[PDB]
Structures are given as structure tokens and as C-alpha cells.
């Protein structure tokens, strides 16, 4: 049976690691009873002999294939186990570390941290922004780098660069990708990029729309585009060696990973609702292509991927050849468990012509939740969405749409959402559900409420002030008032600018595409939901939406957490998750399939 | 030296497990400074490579021989390791589980355990019996059975049964053995067992005298007989393929343990004081017979089993062909440490002709202390004993007999027993004595002392109820009145009936056999000793014939155990057995030896 | 409204001192939500000005008024407080510490207490004995006496006696009363008496039926008879002052509580169902005679006492002259809470008229519980008896009655009881039903219960296995056999030969007139309710009936409190106490206003 707590019985698959013959990756259990993630690393053979480092993540293989860094968290801690017998022994005691990569000599590990002012009382600020979604305040942070030796166990190099820089080994140096700074740092758009080693450093690019996302030693990877314009363009990737060239410059889809080995670059595309593996080895193959999101992959000898679809959370593959799928460990509750396969439609919408998908349940008619991606450039496809299959199994129809302004389509089609949120993607939702009523009679078009978080949450505040199609909505983490987004969230200084307009304080259409500013036309129940420490969508997005629906008589609720970032439906504790998938399931219930006046969240939860 | 610590000093093993080439089994050692019982998994090649897993117990190898799973207590918690390797990783907190077992996927683990009501303030019963040694309180106990994916770390199935239910598989079935219940459960002498598959089951058997211990996929090993008039009966075993077919119909001894491996049944018998190991494939063929206790083996490619004889804890073997000893855990302590061999001797008692053992102690003549067994059908022979060969090594002949009602002879001997406690069975015990006496004259007639658990705890307050020889006796966990024991113990209900008599609320035998009611006639001094969470012999047995004693005058006295069930002069903490030794030797050394007037404990101890 | 909680809304006043023109008492609280009982010493001018001690009870004035000794529990400590300021100072640290009372001189006190073996593990016992209820084990129990100067705060004289001994001053010696041994010790019915000064002693009386509790400092006042023949005999006052002076010879009913005042003796008396306080001075005189219990009273220049009524706690009085109100600690609740105030009815019973009550509820008929007292030597009739309001409140009829054995009354009707329990008095309990039914023509004769704690326990088992009258029983901390408890409790090698009859291992009155042998009978269901640290009437008494019950397929469930002894009802934690008012209400709700099947705990208790 689905419900509330469904979702702690599935092993989570993430960051898939190979050298030689050998994989790790970490299994991630959502431990409902102790309200922790429980993380264990798995070493496969590939054999399916499998061996264990227990509470423990951030597997990285040394290329010599004889040893395994890793991190326990807690202060966190580097340790490091021989392969063979897994003995482990720690090596460095690391607050605030981000990512460890070994060096080729499998003897030094480079690790990129930060620091902040850290006093107890107050946190002191004098760049941009103040804060950002699941990092906190950044109270002045610099980035650190830090080379480690392993067998002496001591930081033999250490610098610091600007907030948000990242660094990769090449060969034995550097490569530096610091955010360039002008009037402020020009984060998502700008970078400068430096080699670097033993204390000196030479710029390779100035001022670039790219930084080094991977090296095999002689040629550096490079994720972005040499300029852009826009943010939202479609991000690409680039081989350095000298000149720099671009390996994908004729297909007009994003680079979602990419990783170099040994000259030959592995990446996935986001397309059309899918998140595709290729190789490029002087021209592009399709690797894993198909109704499914390649959420992690690596390469050495061996091509292994993990691979998410509709109906099942990821799971580990070996590329031969021929795809081999290598583990199965949700296959026994999913014996047991329903899911439902989404069924694609094309609509038409003004222009265009569009993506949608909608699951029926067994059935009358049914009520229907229309879910809205966040994004603007998110997408929409076959991944494993928890609460679509969780609706499902509850008697709702689900219906989806990728709107323009939605990854996986031209670049065109992404940048046409920009200055215009909520109007040509609003009517692209609206005309996929039309579409959709078309073809399921059994949908009842009297019963159809609408949810999304973030950009989806923003769209359910803008569908119950510009439409009365809706009978309820569930809006979370999202956006009334695009002034407040632009000048208190981490991101909106850039951000706004970009997908709203410029001249922010004199720009009408700030308010003309706030759902804040159209609250009197509400008139079906909304349940906002929010979390205190999201910055993407800072609180007063939900909060000023829900004061002021009050202040006009509106039925209107707010559920605030207490803890969590932007992502805290899938990345709050395991209680405070359980209790969200509560709320949101019975306030469809009992606000959609059912009008029931009032919502007694004690007596509703327990 | 022997003394109250010399207990301290053995490695302990059990739970001898093996598939393929590896065997394991649990190495325990008592921890007198900690107080604590320490247990260690070892895990041999077979080699004789060891390797360890430290603090935790229940090796289940599986059935592929890649990896094991085992508990760590503290709440219990079950891990799984790789064989290889022994990296391990936690799969599921445990509390109340009793038992593990893997499916022949290698997968799947099914455990059983337990639930009860909880209430922090009382307990609430509205079945029977209230309570059960080693147990606790029911408190409305259910049987609960989980199957756990090991993968995924999930429960995938669960259901619960009746209280005392046990689970088996059965290919990727479960074989679930429940009490029968008619106006209560019918403990120890009838069940129904089902077939369970995916939440449905099916009747295998209605009110049979057997349950389900061990299968092989094809054939379900059955355990007991097809109807039992007594559950004092001897158990036999049963294949079951479609037809339940009787394998040892024609051998008049009783099973002790079981186990089917593709088609071959491994098999230890209750025989004249040993428990001997045999196979039958067919026909039944000796494997391990002799002086000695079979306490446990396994069977997959090799042969394993665990021996104990009178003058060694056990060790571990390998079958061959030939037996091979294994292990060799005492052999160091046992160069300095004096033991003394039992001699068999052959006696007569009114119509039977019985076996009966002494051990002689250097030498004056040498007092003597008479040991009685539990049961009524519990065995001496050649298991090893503590206090036997504490005390001998004090400077005492040992002299302990089998009387009728001893497991390890005809079915018969075993029943004669029944509503005629006290009666031959003590008269068994005077013969042997007496026996004894002719074949010693160094024992000393005059300093004849009497001692027992249980039912031995019974016969030491009958003997010295009905007999001037004993000059001294020290009773434990006994029965002083069998009415309170059918009426207050864990097993009483059923039991009684048995081994007293049908209407115990009108049998005179109640009273006619019960130590209590003939106080009058002791004149020996007597120790009593209990334990205050023994289910199986309760308290008012001990307390109320030292306070009955107590009103007469008589020299007695009691030692109550704060913790402890009925068997905890073995299963205690090792400070509280340290004590229960510590006193048993005094009590011996100033009531028999040399009597004293007398008797303080606080001098006496420390 | 009345509840489970009720209880805990009322304040508690014991332990009564007055010297001078103070008054100080305890006011205890039971707080549900730390699950404690707090106790406040309250000092009280006379003004009617009040000051406190906090977290502290047992307060001793000193003679001179100057000071006031009291005991903080957690250890015990001692502490000493100026009465002016109440700044105290903390004088000893007292582990067993069970009384203070100071010398004439205002500067020693006198603390008796106990010692025990206290080895960890076990329990040694080799006096009778084992236990005692609201004791535990006695564990070679010695009793203790410390004379404590509380100026240098040290203990400067220390002797012990057997257990179970008391002391008291009488000038500067100290009278020590001893239980004196026979073949046991002659608890409750022989002493012997000590003068004790200086580390010697005189003894003043040897195997007298009474023991010393107070002197003027030249009068000894002794309380019991010069010899009893029953423990059951009705308890009488005697100065000693050289001779031994009756000062209630011509008054035949017992003392409940008496105290010496320069030659006056104050004092109260059980007397058809009231606790009256009396005064002697050369004649008897009245001073607080009526529908109450005098719970408590001290006299010094002042006469303080506590009154308890049917309907109201305990209050505090002063007596004039006239009788003054000076306390109203429950007054406000009481405002808000209705009482149900019982009726006295006469009725005839075999060849005696006794005394019943009942309380009539709003009101159809109304059902009825028959609560059965304790004892048998207890005495129903104007104290609070909480169970009886709260279900009278719910809509029931309560009747109970005097029957004989009963206090109150001349020792002749006391002693009726003996060797005929459940004989004549269960016919007097029958008689009292029959005649306020035909009183209360509204009380449903086809809905009669009935319930009792101790020997209203044995009553109730007793009632159900020889009427078919009752509907529903509430058996608590009972008796089903009497051998066991002859054997087995705190007090039955010689209370159970006096109540129960000579001869226990062989007179056949023990089954005769124990509940446990006629089970059989039982046709209405049943809740048994014990304790398990009862040693008054320990578990077995319930255990047994419950298990033989089950045995023959009768409905019967029992509740067995993990903390606790004989009056855990009253004694046990607040959160144990409301789980038994919530358990009891509900039986009956649910067996005897309105039977439904089954009495699941969890669902009805929470
Ligand atoms: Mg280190
Ligand atoms: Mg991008
Ligand atoms: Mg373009
Ligand atoms: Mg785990
Ligand atoms: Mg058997
Ligand atoms: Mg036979
Ligand atoms: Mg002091
Ligand atoms: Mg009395
Ligand atoms: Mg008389």
C-alpha cells in the first residue's frame, strides 16, 4: 500500500565511482524510526561479489584501483582503506569540505572545502549574497583548497579563492574556476580560470561562460559555453588542450554530466523527458538512450550507470556491449508495490507543439493533480516522482506538461519563458490539460487541482489568481512577488534580471507577473507550504502570499518547517518528509476528491 | 586449582554452523571483572585459518557461502557480512528477534520474533500461561515473522501468529508451526502447521504432536510424533514430501536435534547418559557415538559438530569418514587443571536394572554428595558438569544415578515416571546409593550429602522429607508443592496434569507427593537457593518450604537470587555464578565435610 | 468530572505536630506529569499565618519550640531548621532511616532504622521472614538505633536489635520494644521490652502482648494487651509507670492511635465505622466523636487533629474547647466536584444486626458494586474512599457493608471471623445486598458486581465461585489459596493459623474455604489486579486463580502492576494509580453496566 511512509523502504542508489574491474556507490536508507539517512558504501566486483564500508559516502577510487578515500560524517573525516581487505585508516579530520578527487600518483587527494567568520553571535557580510539554498549564511566564506597526502596524512599545499570557486587536479596542477567579479560576482556566468601549482598560478581564460568540470591529464573538460548571453542557455561542453573545442556544438540539447577519460568524454543529455548517455570519441554514440534519467555514471575500464524511470528509483547498469543491468535492490518491494507508467501525449499550444503525460488510476470519474516542474528550466519525463505514483495509487489522474521555458527541447524553446512567466508556459499547462480531458473522459474536469514546488509552486499561486479551473492547489517553496525574489533570495540578483527583467526597481512586470499582486482573485482552497532555511524561495514568498490571502477572506493554510532548504521534500529529515507526504496527501483528500470544510492538522496527522 | 572462578577460565562454543568449505560457530567467555558474557563469531577454513567477528552472535552462513549474517545485542541488530572480506554492513534493528534463517536466494533472511502490549506500568494477560522462563511476562505476546530483503534492508513480508509460534522456510515458502489452541493452547503437545506464500496459507496438519524443524525444499523435517498421549513421549522425526514418513519407528530413543541436507537426515539420540550423532540416508548410520555429548553440528558439503564429554566443555569436529578434532579452545587450561573421569556402574532397583556414575576424589574415607537430575526426563551421563568436578576435586565422591524417568532409555522407562514422583524414582536413586556404597568403602556412609536443580531440587527436599541417610542438602529452583506448580508456573497447566495428575484441584497425589506437607521429618540442613525470574519453578516453591522449614524449628536457609531465570546457575551473570559456586562449596564444606553451627554468608563470602 | 485523573486534583495532609502555639503537618500532591508524589512541610502560626519547607517530610517540632527536625528523600538526610526563619541546616545522611523523634532536651534526636546484607546479587535469608510488605526482602534485616546530637551532628550512641524492634525515648533512656523469640519471632503478638541507657539495659517486660509508643518522660504509655490470645483481640492502651494501669478496660472496642501528654492521654477509637478522638484524663472523655476518621492528631499546648470525612480529605482542626476548622485545602475543588454522601442502613444477618451503606447516583435501575473491605479486621464506614465516588458519579449504586470480623465493634464480633472466612461473613455481605435492595427499588438486581482489595479480594474470588448473584468482580491483591498464603506471604506462618485455623499442612479447612478449589463455579467474568512487589498477599493469589480460571474456560484477565506492594491503589505512582482507576472503571463499564465481549487494554486504555 502507498502512503506517508512508502518511500522509506526503497534503497537509494548515488554517486557511482569505477576503476579496473571495481564499483562503489553508496546505498542511502531513509530511517523513519532513528529520523536519519543511513549511508553504506558498496564495493562491486563485476563476480556481484559485494563488500561494505558502513556509514560512509563519498566513495573515490584511487586510479591505481589499490585504494578507496571516503568520508564519515558526524565533524567529517577522511579515511582511506585498502581495496583489498577494506582496512581503513583515517587520514585527515575535515569540517566544511565539499569534494575529494585523488591524483593520478593514487597518493594525494585534493580537497575544496571553505571558511566562514563563524561567530557565535552574528554572522558579518560584506559580498553577495548573504546566503544560499542548503549551504546557510555565508558569513564572508571563502573557498579552500587543500592538497592532502594520504600516506603522511598532512596538507602539504593550501590556498583560498573567492566564494563558490572549484578546482580540479590536472595532471599535477590545478585548474582553478573562480566566479569572475565585477560589480558583483557574475555566479552561473562568468568565470575566470587559472592553473595552478606550488604556489603560482597562470590564467588560462578570462571572464569565460564555462569552468573545467574533468582532465585526463593532457586535455581539460570544459562545462558551459565560451559566452552566453543567458544563463538559461543550453550549458555545453568543450575540450582544452590548447584550443579549445567544442564537441557538441551541432546539437541543440544540454550537457546534464560529462566526464573525460583517457580522451573519450561520457555525458548525458537532458531530452525531451529523458536524461540520456552518450560517448563522444570523435563523433557522438548513443550509449543508454530511452525512457529513463541517467542520474550518475563513471568510466574506466568498465561504463557503469544508474539509471532512474518512471516507476523505479535508480539502479546500477554495466555498458558491454549491450546495457547489463547490475543491481536490483528495490526489486523485491516493487513485487509488492503498484506503479504506474505515465502515457506521453503531444498537445498543441498557440505555436507550438508540446510534451505532456498523465497517469491514470483504476477507476465514475476521478479527480486529477496537475503537477508543475520548477525550473522555469526543469523537466518533466521519467524520473521517479514519489508523490505522482503515490496520487496515483490514491484514485487521482496526474498530469504533466514540459511548458516552453523547460529543459530538454531547443534552446529556443527554454529562453522563450524569459519576461514571460506565466504567461505563454501558463497557457501551455492550460492547454495540456484540455488535451489531456480530451483524451480521459474519466477525468473529471469538475474535480482538478494543481501543485508544484519553486517554479511549479510560483505557477500554483499564478494558476488560482488567473484561472477557475482549479478546485485546490498545494503551492511550496515558490514565488508570489518576483521584486523579493530578485533582491533577497541567493540567486535573484542574477537570476531575476535574467528570467523577470531587467531595471528590476522600475520594471512593471515585476508586479504584473506576481501571483501576490492578484490575490483577490482567488477562490479554491490553497495549502502553501514552505521550509526556513530555503534561500532559493526565501519564506516571505509563501508567508506574504498567505497573510494576504488572509487579510481578503481567502481559505488558505500555511505549513512551515522548521528545518530544510529548497529541496526539502526529498532532502528533509525522514519524519519531517513522512509529515509533508501527510499533509500533502490529505489535503487533496480532503480539499480536491472531497470539499470538506476546515483542515484539523492534529486530528488529520495523529 | 577449582574454585567458585575456575567457570571463568573455558572458552564456551556454540552454534556451530557450515556451508561449503567454512564452518563458524560463537567462542563465548565469562568476563568476571565486566560481569559480562563475551561473544566472539570464528570462522575456520577448514586450513585451520581463523577469522573473527567480534561482539555479536547468530552466524548464518548463506546458502551460497558469499556472506553471513549476524547479531549484535546490546537493542539487537542484525548485519550481514561478506565472507571474503568480513566488511559488514547493519541491515535491520532488531528488537525481540529469536531467530534468523536465510532463503536459498541468499537473499532473503526470514526472522521470528515477538511482540507484547508494553505498558511501562503493569502487565495484562488474557491468555495463558502469564509468563514463561527466560522469557518474562507475556504481556498478550504475539509471534511475529519478518522476511528481510538483506539487499534493500527492508521488510518485504510480515504477519504474526499466535505466541510460540515458530517459522521455517520452505523453498520460498514458510512452514509456520502454531499452538494449538482448545480452552487454551495445547503447549508441547499439539499444533497446526501452514504453508505460507505472499500473504496466504494453507493447512499442512491439524492438532498434530509435531512441528516443523528443518527443510531441505523438497521434504519438511517434522519433529515429535503424529499424536502424543505425553508429551513426555519420545520425539521422534518425520519426513514430510506428501506422505509423512517415520524414519527411526523402530529405534526407541528420543531425537535430541535434526537437520536435513538434500535428502540425508543428521541426527543426535538421548542414549544411556550420551547424546550420540547420526545420519540416516536410508538406513541410520553411526557417526559420532561414545562418551559424550553431541551439543550441536551442521551439515552442507562437511560435517561439522560440537562434543563435550564429562572432563572437557565442548570442542568442535569435522566428520570425514573419520572424526577429525578441530579445535582445541581448553586444551591449554586443562594440562594444569585436574579432572576426574565419571565410573559407570550398573545397579538394580526393584524391577529395573539402572546406570548409575560416581566420581572418586583423592584420599580416611571421603564424604559423598549425591547429584539428581532435572526433568523428571533430564539425563546425566557425559556432558560436563561444574560442580562435579568442583567438588571433587574438594576432597568428594560424586555418585548421581538415571532413575526411571530419565530421557536416554525405552519410552517406557521414561513414562513410568508419570504420577509417580518420589515414589521408584526416588527409591532408584536409595538403590544406587547403596550400590555405590559397596563398590566405595572409602565413602563415607556417615557423610552422605544430597543436592539438585529443578527436579533434582524437588528430590533433594523429598529425600530429605522421607530419608535419614543425608546429612545435608542444598535445593534449587525445586518443587516443594506441586499444586502451586501447576497452577503458577510457566508450563504447569499442561505439565502437571502429566506428571502428577489429571484434576488437580481433587488429586490427593498433589499434596501425597509434595515435599512441603512431611517438613516435619527434616533433619538435615538444608540450603535453599532460587532465583527471582524463574518462570519454570516460581519462588513460592523455594520460600515457602524454608518458611514452612523456618515455623519447625528446622536448620535452613535460603539464597534468592535477585536476577535470573531457572537456569541461571549456568546462564547468570558470572559474578552471580561466582556467588551461587562460592556458596554451594561452603555450604558442602561446613554442613557435610565438617558440620559447623551456623552459617554466615557476609565471613563465609568475603 | 470525576475520572481517572480526579485524584490527583486534591491536596494531602498527614503526620500532624504541635508544640507550643505551631502546628506543622505534610501536604502531599500527586503530580501526574512528573509522575511524583511532592511533599511541603507546612508550619501554621494559630493567626493562621503559614510558612513552608520544601521537597520534605516527617516534621518534628522540638520540645522547646526553637527547631524543627525533618527528613529530605531522594538517600535520607536529616535536617535541622530555627522555627523562626526556617534557615536549616542539613545534620546526617541517613540510608534505613524509619523515625526521628527528639528528646526532652531539644538538642538528640532518636533514629530507628534498619540494616541489611545488601550483597548485589542475592538475597540471604536464615530468620523469618523473607520479606515484608512495602519493605521488600528482609535480607538478615537488623533493626538500628542512633541517638543523634544535632548541634555537633553526629551519632554519639549506636546499638541494633532484631529485626522488627522499636524504640522510643523516655527521658534520657530509651524503651526498645523487641518481637520475642520462640521458634520464630512472635511478630504482632509477643515483645519483649528494654530500658535502655548508656550501652545497657534493663528489661521491664518479657513476651507481653504489647509494645511501648510514648512516655510523658515518667509515664510509659503501651499499646496492646499484658497477653492476647489473637493477634485480632481489640489493641488497648496502658500507662506503665511501675504498674501497669488499663485505661480502657470497660471499653470494649480497639485504639486506633494514642499519645501521652503530661499524664493525659489523648487518643482514638474504631467504632462503627467512624475513628472518634478521645481524651482520658482520670475519665474518658468525647472530644471528636461523629460521621469521621480521625486520621492523625498531636497535643501539646494545643490539640491539633485531621478529620477525613466520606465526602472530603483530610482536613486539619484544632480543638478549643470546641472543635475549629483551620484548614480548606480541598474547598475549592470540592465547590465544583460532586460527592455522593453514603446512607447508613441497618440490617439482620443470621443471629446480628450490622451496619450497611450505600450511595445512590443520578439515576431506569442503576447498576450496583458491592465493595468488600480488607482485613478481615477492616472497617468500612466515613473515610474518602475514592473508587466508590468516581463510580457512583458514573451512575452506580455502591454498597458495602461491616461484616463481622470487621473492626468497630465489640472483639466478640472481631473474632467471629476466625476459622470461618467466607463462611458466615460472606453470608453477612449476601444478607447487606438483600436488604438495601429492598431499600432501593431502582438498583438493578440483574446487575450487581463486586470488588475488593486484600481480604475483599479474597472476598470477591469467593463471592463469584459460591453465587451466581454477581455479574462482574474486580478481585485485587487477593487471596484464592490459603496454604500458599500461609506459606508464602509476609505475615501467614502466624496470621493464617489464627484466621485460616491450626495445623496448615494438614487442615482441610486451607482448600476448604480458598476460592482457587471451587473456580469450577465461576460464571461471571473476572479482572484480577496485583502487584509485584505484594508480599502481603503475594502474586501467586492471582496468578493461580487467573491461570486455573483460564484452565477451565472461564472469562477472566489479569493486570499485574510492575511496581508495588499490598496498597499500590493508594501508594503506587500517580501515572500506576490513574492506569488502575482508568482499568477499574472501565471493567465495569464494560462487564457490568453493560457487557460487551473481549476488553482490549490498548484500544480502552489509550
Ligand atoms: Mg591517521
Ligand atoms: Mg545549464
Ligand atoms: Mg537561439
Ligand atoms: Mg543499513
Ligand atoms: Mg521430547
Ligand atoms: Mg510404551
Ligand atoms: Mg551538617
Ligand atoms: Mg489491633
Ligand atoms: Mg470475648
Not at 24 to 34: D, F, G, I, R, W
Not at 169 to 188: C, E, N
Not at 294 to 322: H, Q
Request: include cysteine; charge should be negative; proline fraction near 3%.
Amino acid at each position: 500500500e502507498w502512503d506517508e511512509k512508502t518511500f522509506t523502504k526503497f534503497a537509494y542508489l548515488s554517486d557511482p565511482r569505477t576503476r579496473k574491474n571495481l564499483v562503489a556507490y553508496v546505498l542511502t536508507k531513509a530511517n523513519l524510526e532513528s529520523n536519519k539517512y543511513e549511508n553504506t558504501i558498496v564495493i562491486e566486483n563485476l563476480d556481484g561479489s559485494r563488500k561494505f564500508i558502513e556509514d560512509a559516502s563519498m566513495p573515490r577510487i584511487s586510479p591505481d584501483g589499490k585504494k578507496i578515500a571516503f568520508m564519515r560524517f558526524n565533524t567529517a573525516q577522511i579515511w582511506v582503506a585498502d581495496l583489498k581487505t577494506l582496512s581503513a585508516k583515517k587520514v585527515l579530520e575535515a569540517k566544511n569540505i565539499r569534494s575529494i578527487e585523488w591524483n593520478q600518483d593514487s597518493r594525494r587527494l585534493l580537497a575544496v572545502g571553505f571558511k566562514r567568520r563563524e561567530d557565535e553571535d552574528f554572522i558579518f557580510e560584506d559580498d553577495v549574497p548573504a546566503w544560499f539554498d542548503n549551504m546557510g549564511f555565508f558569513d564572508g566564506e571563502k573557498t579552500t583548497f587543500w592538497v592532502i597526502d594520504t600516506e603522511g596524512e598532512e596538507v602539504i599545499e593550501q590556498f583560498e579563492k573567492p566564494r563558490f570557486s572549484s578546482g580540479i587536479w590536472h595532471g599535477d596542477s590545478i585548474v582553478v574556476s573562480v566566479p569572475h567579479r565585477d560589480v558583483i560576482p557574475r555566479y552561473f556566468k562568468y568565470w575566470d580560470i587559472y592553473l595552478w601549482k606550488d604556489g603560482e598560478e597562470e590564467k588560462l581564460f578570462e571572464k569565460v561562460s564555462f569552468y573545467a568540470i574533468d582532465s585526463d591529464g593532457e586535455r581539460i573538460l570544459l562545462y558551459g559555453k565560451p559566452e552566453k548571453k543567458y544563463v538559461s542557455e543550453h550549458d555545453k561542453i568543450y575540450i582544452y588542450d590548447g584550443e579549445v573545442k567544442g564537441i557538441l556544438d551541432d546539437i541543440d540539447r544540454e550537457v546534464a554530466q560529462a566526464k573525460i577519460r583517457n580522451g573519450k568524454v561520457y555525458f548525458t543529455l537532458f531530452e525531451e523527458g529523458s536524461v540520456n548517455l552518450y560517448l563522444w570519441d570523435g563523433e557522438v554514440r548513443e550509449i543508454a538512450k530511452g525512457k529513463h534519467w541517467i542520474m550518475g555514471f563513471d568510466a574506466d575500464e568498465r561504463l557503469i550507470y544508474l539509471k532512474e524511470t518512471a516507476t523505479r528509483p535508480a539502479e546500477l547498469y554495466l555498458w558491454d556491449g549491450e546495457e547489463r543491468q547490475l543491481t536490483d535492490y528495490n526489486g523485491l518491494i516493487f513485487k509488492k508495490l503498484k506503479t504506474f507508467e505515465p502515457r506521453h501525449f503531444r498537445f498543441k499550444s498557440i505555436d507550438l507543439e508540446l510534451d505532456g503525460w498523465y497517469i491514470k488510476p483504476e477507476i465514475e470519474k476521478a479527480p486529477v493533480i496537475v503537477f508543475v516542474h520548477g525550473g522555469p528550466k526543469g523537466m518533466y519525463g521519467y524520473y521517479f516522482k514519489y508523490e505522482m505514483q503515490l496520487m496515483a495509487s490514491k484514485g487521482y489522474y496526474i498530469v504533466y506538461v514540459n511548458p516552453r521555458g523547460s529543459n530538454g527541447y531547443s534552446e529556443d524553446f527554454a529562453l522563450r519563458v524569459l519576461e514571460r512567466t506565466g504567461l505563454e508556459d501558463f497557457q501551455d499547462i492550460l492547454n495540456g490539460i484540455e488535451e489531456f480531458l480530451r483524451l480521459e473522459p474519466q477525468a473529471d474536469r469538475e474535480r482538478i487541482g494543481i501543485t508544484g514546488i519553486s517554479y511549479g509552486g510560483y505557477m500554483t499561486n499564478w494558476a488560482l489568481t488567473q484561472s477557475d479551473l482549479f478546485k485546490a492547489g498545494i503551492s511550496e517553496n515558490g514565488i508570489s512577488y518576483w521584486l523579493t525574489s530578485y533582491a533577497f533570495s541567493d540567486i535573484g540578483l542574477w537570476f531575476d534580471k535574467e528570467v523577470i527583467g531587467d531595471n528590476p526597481l522600475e520594471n512593471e512586470n515585476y508586479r504584473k507577473l506576481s501571483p501576490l499582486f492578484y490575490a483577490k482573485n482567488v477562490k479554491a482552497p490553497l495549502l502553501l507550504i514552505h521550509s526556513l532555511e530555503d534561500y532559493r524561495c526565501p519564506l516571505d514568498q509563501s508567508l506574504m502570499f498567505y497573510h494576504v490571502l488572509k487579510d481578503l477572506g481567502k481559505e488558505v493554510y500555511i505549513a512551515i518547517f522548521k528545518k530544510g532548504a529548497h529541496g526539502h521534500s526529498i532532502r528533509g529529515s525522514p519524519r519531517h518528509r513522512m509529515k509533508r507526504y501527510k499533509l500533502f496527501m490529505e489535503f487533496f483528500e480532503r480539499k480536491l476528491k472531497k470539499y470538506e470544510e476546515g483542515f484539523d492538522v492534529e486530528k488529520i496527522l495523529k
